[PDB]
C-alpha cells in the first residue's frame, strides 16, 4: 500500500515557527508532485501548497506565502513544510497527499492518498501532560479520564487496540482553566469483570506522555 | 481564487435510500473534453479524508459501486445509489483545475434511524482524583436516538447550572446512534459537603436518573 507517514506536529508561539515531514513510501515519490491540506478544528478542509516531483515548482495559498517554504527530498522519499511566523489561524490538522504525476503534461489522479495527519497549536500557553483517571462502575461501563493537558491531541485506545467493539473516545472539552479534559469508555459484558482487564492506552506526544491504565 | 458552493449542508437520509449532493463552482472546471477538474472526498470521524471520485466522475480504488459523479463546467454531483449505515460522515468537493485548490463547505450525511433510549452510567471521582485536590464526576449516555438529549445534574437534589461540560461522539457507523459524555466538576471541599449524585436524563417527557451516595 502507498502510505504517508506525517510528523512534526505540536505546540508553539504566535510569531514562532516549526517543521512539518511527511514520508511516503509504496510509490516513487520522486514522480509525483506532493500537497498539504490543513483541517482548523472544526473546520473545512483548506489547501496549503504543492510542490512538483522535481522540485521545479511550488505554490502557496496567499495566506501562506513568504512565511510558509514547502520543500522535498527525494532521496529520502520525504516532505516537508518550514512554517514560520506561525499565527492563530495556523492551528489546524495538516495533512499531506499524494497529487499529480510530474509526462509532458502532468496527469491528475485526484488527492489519492492521504497521511494520517500531524496537529499543530498556536498558542502562547505551555504544555502539559494529562492525568488518567479509572472510570470504575448485564452490561457494565469503564473508562479512562484524560484530564488537563494541552494542546491537543490524545489518542486513546484499549487493550494495546485489541478491544474495538463498545469503545468511545468523545472530543475533548476545553475547561476554563484553559486545559483539556476527555474521556473514554467501553461497554463490556459484566460476567467477565474477573476474569479479563481492562487496560486504556493514552499517548499524549506534545508532553512525551504515555500511560497505560488498567481500570478496576 | 475559485468559490466552490455545496448543497446541502446537512443531509439526513434513511439506509437504502438514494443520496446526491451537489457542487457549484464559480468559474468552468472543463479544461479539456472529457477532463472536468472536480473531486469529491469522504472525511469519516476521526480519520484522514479519502478520495471518492477525481475528474468529475472517475470512481477511485476501492470505493464501492454505490458512488458515483457527474456533471460539466460549472455544476457536479455526487450520488449514492442506495445509502448505508457506514457512509455518514462529511462529503467535499474539490476543484484541482487550478491552484489554490479549494473545497466546498462541506456536507454532513446524517443517518435517520428509529428512537433508542441511551444506557447511563455515572462514574465518581477516582480516590486518586480526589487526592489531588479535585472531584470530576462523569455521566455516560451510551447508544442513543436522536441527538438530542437534556443532562441535568443534581447535588443533593439541587439543579447544577455553569459547572458542567459535555460531548458528544459523531454517529456511529453501525448503529447510527450518538453517545455522550457529561462532566460536573468540583473543588474536594465542595465534593465532600454534599451526599446524593444524581444525572438525569430527559429525551421528550422521560427522564431517567443515576446516582451514587458518597458515604456509601
Known amino acids: 500500500e502507498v502510505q504517508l507517514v506525517e510528523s512534526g506536529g505540536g505546540l508553539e508561539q504566535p510569531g514562532g515557527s516549526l517543521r512539518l515531514s511527511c514520508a511516503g513510501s509504496?510509490?516513487?515519490?520522486?514522480?509525483?508532485?506532493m500537497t498539504w491540506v490543513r483541517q482548523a478544528p472544526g473546520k473545512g478542509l483548506e489547501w496549503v501548497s504543492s510542490?512538483?516531483?522535481?522540485?521545479?515548482?511550488?505554490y502557496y495559498a496567499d495566506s501562506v506565502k513568504g512565511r510558509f517554504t514547502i520543500s522535498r527530498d527525494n532521496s529520502k522519499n520525504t516532505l516537508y513544510l518550514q512554517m514560520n511566523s506561525l499565527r492563530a489561524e495556523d492551528t489546524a490538522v495538516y495533512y499531506c497527499?499524494?497529487?499529480?504525476?510530474?509526462?509532458?503534461?502532468?496527469?491528475?489522479?485526484?488527492?489519492?492518498?492521504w497521511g494520517q495527519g500531524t496537529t499543530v497549536t498556536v498558542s502562547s500557553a505551555s504544555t502539559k501532560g494529562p492525568s488518567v483517571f479509572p472510570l470504575a462502575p448485564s452490561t457494565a461501563a469503564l473508562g479512562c479520564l484524560v484530564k488537563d493537558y494541552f494542546p491537543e491531541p490524545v489518542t486513546v485506545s484499549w487493550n494495546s487496540g485489541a478491544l474495538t467493539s463498545g469503545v468511545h473516545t468523545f472530543p475533548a472539552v476545553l475547561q476554563s482553566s484553559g486545559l483539556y479534559s476527555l474521556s473514554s469508555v467501553v461497554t463490556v459484558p459484566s460476567s467477565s469483570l474477573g476474569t479479563k482487564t481492562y487496560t486504556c492506552n493514552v499517548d499524549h506526544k506534545p508532553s512525551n506522555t504515555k500511560v497505560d491504565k488498567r481500570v478496576e | 481564487d475559485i468559490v466552490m458552493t455545496q448543497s446541502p449542508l446537512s443531509l439526513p437520509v434513511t439506509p437504502g435510500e438514494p443520496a446526491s449532493i451537489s457542487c457549484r463552482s464559480s468559474?468552468?472546471?472543463?479544461?479539456?473534453?472529457?477532463?472536468?477538474?472536480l473531486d469529491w472526498y469522504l472525511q469519516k470521524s476521526g480519520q484522514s479524508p479519502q478520495l471518492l471520485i477525481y475528474?468529475?466522475?472517475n470512481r477511485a480504488s476501492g470505493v464501492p459501486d454505490r458512488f458515483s459523479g457527474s456533471g460539466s463546467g460549472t455544476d457536479f454531483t455526487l450520488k449514492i445509489s442506495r445509502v448505508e449505515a457506514e457512509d455518514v460522515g462529511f462529503y467535499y468537493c474539490?476543484?484541482?483545475?487550478?491552484?489554490?485548490?479549494?473545497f466546498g463547505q462541506g456536507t454532513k450525511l446524517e443517518i435517520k434511524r428509529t428512537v433508542a433510549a441511551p444506557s447511563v452510567f455515572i462514574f465518581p471521582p477516582s480516590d486518586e482524583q480526589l487526592k489531588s485536590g479535585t472531584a470530576s464526576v462523569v455521566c455516560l449516555l451510551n447508544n442513543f436516538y436522536p441527538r438530542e438529549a437534556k443532562v441535568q445534574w443534581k447535588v443533593d437534589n439541587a439543579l447544577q447550572s455553569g459547572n458542567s461540560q459535555e460531548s458528544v461522539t459523531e454517529q456511529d457507523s453501525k448503529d447510527s446512534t450518538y453517545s455522550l459524555s457529561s462532566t460536573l466538576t468540583l473543588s474536594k471541599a465542595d465534593y465532600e459537603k454534599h451526599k446524593v449524585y444524581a444525572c438525569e436524563v430527559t429525551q421528550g417527557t422521560t427522564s431517567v436518573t443515576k446516582s451514587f451516595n458518597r458515604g456509601e
Open positions: 497527499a499524494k497529487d499529480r504525476l510530474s509526462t509532458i503534461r502532468p496527469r491528475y489522479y485526484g488527492l489519492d492518498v
Open positions: 475528474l468529475g466522475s
Open positions: 468559474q468552468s472546471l472543463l479544461y479539456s473534453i472529457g477532463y472536468n477538474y
Open positions: 509504496g510509490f516513487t515519490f520522486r514522480d509525483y508532485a
Open positions: 474539490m476543484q484541482a483545475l487550478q491552484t489554490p485548490y479549494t
Open positions: 510542490i512538483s516531483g522535481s522540485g521545479g515548482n511550488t
